[PDB]
Amino acid sequence: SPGIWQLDCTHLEGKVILVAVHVASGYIEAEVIPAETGQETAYFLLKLAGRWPVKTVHTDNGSNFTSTTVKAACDWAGIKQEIESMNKELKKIIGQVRDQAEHLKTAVQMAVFIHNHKRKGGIGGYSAGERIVDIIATDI
Amino acid sequence: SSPGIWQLDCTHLEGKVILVAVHVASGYIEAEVIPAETGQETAYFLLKLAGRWPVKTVHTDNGSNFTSTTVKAACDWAGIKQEDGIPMNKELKKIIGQVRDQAEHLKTAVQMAVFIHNHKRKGGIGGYSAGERIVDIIATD
Ligand SMILES: OCc1cccc2c1OCCO2
Numbered sequence: 001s002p003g004i005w006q007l008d009c010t011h012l013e014g015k016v017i018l019v020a021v022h023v024a025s026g027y028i029e030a031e032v033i034p035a036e037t038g039q040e041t042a043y044f045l046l047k048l049a050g051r052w053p054v055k056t057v058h059t060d061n062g063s064n065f066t067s068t069t070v071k072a073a074c075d076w077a078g079i080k081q082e083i084e085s086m087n088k089e090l091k092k093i094i095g096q097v098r099d100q101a102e103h104l105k106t107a108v109q110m111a112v113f114i115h116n117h118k119r120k121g122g123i124g125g126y127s128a129g130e131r132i133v134d135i136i137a138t139d140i
Numbered sequence: 141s142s143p144g145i146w147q148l149d150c151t152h153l154e155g156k157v158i159l160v161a162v163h164v165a166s167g168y169i170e171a172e173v174i175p176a177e178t179g180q181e182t183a184y185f186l187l188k189l190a191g192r193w194p195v196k197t198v199h200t201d202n203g204s205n206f207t208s209t210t211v212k213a214a215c216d217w218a219g220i221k222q223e224d225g226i227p228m229n230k231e232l233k234k235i236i237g238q239v240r241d242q243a244e245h246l247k248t249a250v251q252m253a254v255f256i257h258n259h260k261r262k263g264g265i266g267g268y269s270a271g272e273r274i275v276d277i278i279a280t281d
């Protein structure tokens with residue numbers, strides 16, 4: 001359903017990459033953070049929800065997600081708190097481009113760009129960015 | 141007003157710089173507090189924006205950050221056409237003021253304001269938000 005996202009962390013170069021996947025489309029948002037703190041997580045969730053209509057997020061077990069800053073952000077934004085493949089693709093691409101830039105955070109945004117624009121399938125296929133927008137637009 | 145066209149503008153507040161991109165056809169906004177209007181910060185903001193929405197053309201204020209070759213390079217790589225100097229933000233500073241006392245730091249208040257802006261129904265109860273308008277305009281199927 002159009003409002004559901006899943007969030008995962010990937011540790012790399014001594015930093016964390018926070019990755020949200022829009023489950024129905026495979027579309028991705030990601031950010032590089034210093035550590036998976038409650039405040040970082042809350043801020044990331046607030047940005048996501050101000051850009052897309054987030055109803056529910058699926059997370060893992062981390063103490064970041066139960067922090068009071070994350071609960072305050074979720075209450076304010078209206079988010080209920082509770083792919084392997086899209087993530088495996090993502091880290092794959094960061095791998096294939098990491099060399100083209102100094103900072104991890106540059107290579108990560110380049111990987112997001114490449115993931116979200118890439119057409120899947122044949123001549124009549126769609127990119128993840130197209131799928132998420134088509135899904136949401138249809139929902140109304 | 142076509143679908144790939146964004147306008148980028150700077151606002152200065154509490155001695156901080158806010159970079160704002162507006163999708164001209166819908167009024168939808170993306171915004172971030174950045175350290176200063178450097179080429180590298182500008183390039184990175186644009187790269188993030190264009191990986192999330194299909195950005196074909198950007199209208200900028202022709203600031204020295206946009207004329208740098210590091211912005212030019214980011215635009216070439218992303219397939220974005222720069223129109224430098226070619227031709228509600230006071231409502232943003234307003235919304236920022238309406239949420240400012242629920243957040244210690246300006247950057248959090250900015251993202252709250254971005255959220256209120258893109259959710260707001262414009263034109264009475266019969267109308268649509270900027271978030272509904274951008275998806276409507278941009279969807280290919
Ligand atoms: O895709 C964006 C979108 C689609 C529908 C509603 C929205 C919205 O953005 C932020 C809030 O409201």
Ligand SMILES: [Cl-]
Nearest residue numbers: 148149150201
């Ligand atoms: Cl600017």
